[PDB]
Amino acid sequence: SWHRPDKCCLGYQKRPLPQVLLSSWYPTSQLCSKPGVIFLTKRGRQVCADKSKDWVKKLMQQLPVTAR
């Protein structure tokens, strides 16, 4: 019990994701080494993205944050 593992982004999707493929997003733990956000695609996929990139901050604006 306690101390469950956490989901962290150890790498990033390089090429910008088209919004129409995505449903929402959620931030990773601030304790993760690499600061990242996970985009949830409409297909169901979980994609790691670099929050420093303008395109991702754009998606963060346009998409709603989702709860786990």
Side-chain angles (χ1 to χ4, degrees), residues 3 5-67:
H3 298 115
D6 284 292
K7 280 189 275 70
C8 292
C9 290
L10 304 184
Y12 311 122
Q13 184 85 323
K14 340 82 166 307
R15 44 187 176 76
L17 293 157
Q19 176 173 43
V20 172
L21 191 64
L22 295 354
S23 84
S24 59
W25 66 277
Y26 56 93
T28 52
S29 166
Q30 299 289 309
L31 294 180
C32 291
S33 194
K34 288 164 68 275
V37 294
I38 299 165
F39 286 103
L40 288 171
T41 71
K42 296 173 178 167
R43 168 191 173 210
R45 278 51 285 261
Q46 277 181 50
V47 188
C48 272
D50 183 342
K51 53 205 314 289
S52 81
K53 277 39 176 61
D54 296 320
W55 68 265
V56 317
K57 300 201 273 188
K58 230 172 301 174
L59 283 171
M60 287 165 71
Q61 282 191 158
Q62 41 192 250
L63 292 173
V65 163
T66 194

